Design a protein around this ligand. Structure first.
Ligand SMILES: NC(=O)c1ccc[n+]([C@@H]2O[C@H](COP(=O)([O-])OP(=O)(O)OC[C@H]3O[C@@H](n4cnc5c(N)ncnc54)[C@H](OP(=O)(O)O)[C@@H]3O)[C@H](O)[C@H]2O)c1
Ligand SMILES: NC(=O)c1ccc[n+]([C@@H]2O[C@H](COP(=O)([O-])OP(=O)(O)OC[C@H]3O[C@@H](n4cnc5c(N)ncnc54)[C@H](OP(=O)(O)O)[C@@H]3O)[C@H](O)[C@H]2O)c1
Ligand SMILES: [Mg+2]
Ligand SMILES: [Mg+2]
Lengths: 414, 414
């Protein structure tokens, strides 16, 4: 079983919290299915470029291609979707990036995107949403949005703990719930599917710990812990409580008058981070209406997904939203959208998303220089309204660049 | 125990599917907590008015006040929140309307709004969202939105089947799941809260049956069954399947090419209703972006809540959104927002919501005449931009009417 590791580079090492990043590291990349094949090459080009421009030849990346999804079955024999070589390599190599993956209906396989995340314990799904100036938006003021969404990745209904309607198993479960648990509340027990939803002190606390720290480090204004927690009192309602607990405990939360909101004092800055909560259904409105009062946000798995895609449409770029799956031993950055099964190979989709994800990646390695070079190029291209189809078609005379040509525009604006 | 039933009217009867509505019916109303006290009187005024104007004195309503929430404890002794007199009366009287209710933290009581709905088996939460012309909206084209949200009310995580983190009970459940069910997937079993999520053939099918029928009767264009069903395969993924099944089965769905979408032929009209699906997280974007392609929509409990409040902010009026809880033996219309615990008694909040809900109510009784009178008055007031605070404060010189005065403006525009 083999992936040709490049003879040109050196592994990144995690020397106790410190990510030791060499000058020529091996960073693995999973290509993708559909436009993964378009998108990815645009990414490598702009990344390699940002690296040349910034460090004037000193540093560079030995990209190692790994396999997952469609390609895995082709390379490893169709029956293999997520081989382990891939799981080790991400762990071992420390930082990895990926294009879009598809999960095959038919053979009882759960979401490949979620399989990677759960398996590698990448419990922090980091999703930042902000308005690049000149991006055609459906809302009046897309510029008021600049949020950093911290979504729990290892729990919630998203785990995959469910028994099919009428299976002997679901059947056994209902017998348990009613017979033993006293659940006189499942409305129609016959042919009823059951899903399970967990929330631990551990899972929520480790997530919030991460979120507040991001706030302190980047001097953010607040941390909003969202939860549909007045109905789900012991899962979501406990998300809120443990989060507040943590802010008080580990960070020194002072009460803002009669509660429940806290105050965390930013050591490095003197400013005080407001720790507050907002119920999920009411939050979905608050973000269209008073979006300038939210900054960093902590969520469970389900709401995090919903809030990311909701916030990403208002600021236009559903096609340019970046994402990171972060855990303790490694990290996996990714493209947050499909490949569009009709567009593959046509060199037509917006390659923004994967590009910003590499931007996030490059920043995480400590190459802050190549990072803002990429983001500046991005704004350059967009502002010059010489953009890709998805944007071009809502713009008053934008030049229509293809995927690759767009990557180029980014290099031209660095 | 007593509610003074009015000597002035006659009960509505449900004579087998046909709602026999007298000329002077007794329609019960639950006032509300906080602005329930503002809002409600505005409603009764405009309703009584619509009824005078339309039927020229012939018909009228003997309003019977019932009790739930804060008021219940006052009238019935504080310890009683949802007395049964109230539960019978709604059933017996057939149609009831309500203001906002609050649920007390502290005494282990679940949501009063959800208690009523579950208890009376009002399994259809009907939530229509459309743009009244002149309502200050945060999106560029709030006018493209005209959806009728059919949300499942008796199932989903919303049932209240959960065991607190660390309780002996949750503890027993985890032992079951891992020991007996082979669930090597609850990430941190220690101090983990567990919620339960069911979905029956029965619950989803009865909901979709209702939704499509609404489409046929009102000549709607399509029925979008939404579901986060590629991760929740046996609850949400089964919502989708059973729904399609129903459309094929009971309504005669023909396939649109290679699937999965169907075609239901509107008997009364010749037009063909498209039955399609959209995954939940992708739907939350599609509604900001291509909102004109969605019409009627079927949902489970959780997504229905999220989609209602999401759609209601884009079309501005989060404060004017109406709602209906419909079941087989009775129906309960309601105000879909809070009372704002700082605004109560100040005669300041927008009374739209409760007013439209009575509009919906009046329509359901068969008084289609009083119904569009109210909605025409509504548009009149708003268009004349002589509106309430919440609207007035985003309008270029609107006259600032108080709650009551606004009710009046509605009567002035009929
Ligand atoms: N993180 C991920 O890798 C990820 C996440 C979710 C789903 N997927 C997958 O991708 C698949 C493809 O099918 P779908 O079409 O149903 O996917 P989808 O991702 O929901 O599609 C979103 C659509 O919006 C537009 N948009 C978003 N990405 C764009 C881009 N790169 N360039 C231009 N405009 C963009 C395109 O509109 P048009 O289609 O109209 O051009 C695009 O196809 C499956 O849905 C799913 O397995 C992958
Ligand atoms: N269907 C229901 O009866 C229902 C549903 C949900 C919650 N509630 C309850 O109501 C409570 C009150 O607290 P909350 O303030 O947190 O409630 P909330 O309903 O989330 O508050 C929404 C806020 O948006 C604005 N808005 C919505 N209703 C309005 C109206 N009638 N007039 C003018 N603008 C309007 C007001 O802004 P400002 O507050 O800034 O003025 C309003 O208070 C509890 O949240 C909850 O138990 C009742
Ligand atoms: Mg998602
Ligand atoms: Mg709601």
């Amino acid at each position: 079983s083999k992936v040709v590791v490049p003879a040109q580079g050196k592994k990144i090492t995690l020397q106790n919290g410190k990510l030791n990043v060499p000058e020529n590291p091996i960073i693995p990349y999973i290509e993708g299915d559909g436009i993964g094949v378009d998108v990815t090459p645009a990414m490598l080009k702009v990344v390699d470029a940002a690296v040349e421009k910034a460090y004037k030849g000193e540093r560079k990346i030995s990209w190692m291609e790994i396999y997952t999804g469609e390609k895995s079955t082709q390379v490893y024999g169709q029956d293999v979707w997520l081989p382990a070589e891939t799981l080790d390599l991400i762990r071992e190599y420390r930082v990895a990036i990926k294009g879009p993956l598809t999960t095959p209906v038919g053979g009882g396989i759960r979401s490949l995107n979620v399989a990677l995340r759960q398996e590698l314990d990448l419990y922090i799904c980091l999703r930042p949403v902000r308005y690049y100036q000149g991006t055609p938006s459906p809302v009046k003021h897309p510029e008021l949005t600049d949020m950093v969404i911290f979504r729990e990745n290892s729990e919630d209904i998203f785990a995959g703990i469910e028994w099919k309607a009428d299976s002997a198993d679901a059947e056994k479960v209902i017998k348990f719930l009613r017979e033993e648990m006293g659940v006189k509340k499942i409305r129609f027990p016959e042919h009823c599917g059951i899903g399970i939803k967990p929330c631990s002190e551990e899972g929520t606390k480790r997530l919030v710990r991460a979120a507040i720290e991001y706030a302190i480090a980047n001097d953010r204004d607040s941390v909003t812990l969202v939860h549909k927690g007045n109905i789900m009192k012991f899962t979501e309602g406990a998300f809120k409580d443990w989060g507040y607990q943590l802010a008080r405990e580990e960070f020194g939360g002072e009460l803002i008058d009669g509660g429940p909101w806290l105050k965390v004092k930013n050591p490095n800055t003197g400013k005080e981070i407001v720790i507050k909560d907002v119920i999920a259904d009411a939050f979905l409105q608050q973000i269209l209406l008073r979006p300038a009062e939210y900054d960093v946000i902590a969520c469970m798995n389900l709401n995090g997904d919903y809030i990311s895609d909701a916030l990403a449409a208002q600021v236009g770029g559903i096609g340019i939203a970046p994402g990171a799956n972060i855990g303790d031993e490694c990290a996996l950055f990714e493209a947050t959208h499909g490949t569009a099964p009709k567009y593959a190979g046509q060199d037509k989709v917006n390659p923004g998303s994967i590009i910003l994800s590499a931007e996030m990646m490059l920043r995480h390695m400590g190459w802050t220089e190549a990072a803002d070079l990429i983001v500046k190029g991005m704004e350059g291209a967009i502002n010059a309204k010489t953009v890709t189809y998805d944007f071009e078609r809502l713009m008053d005379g934008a030049k229509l660049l293809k995927c690759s040509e767009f990557g180029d525009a980014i290099i031209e604006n660095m």
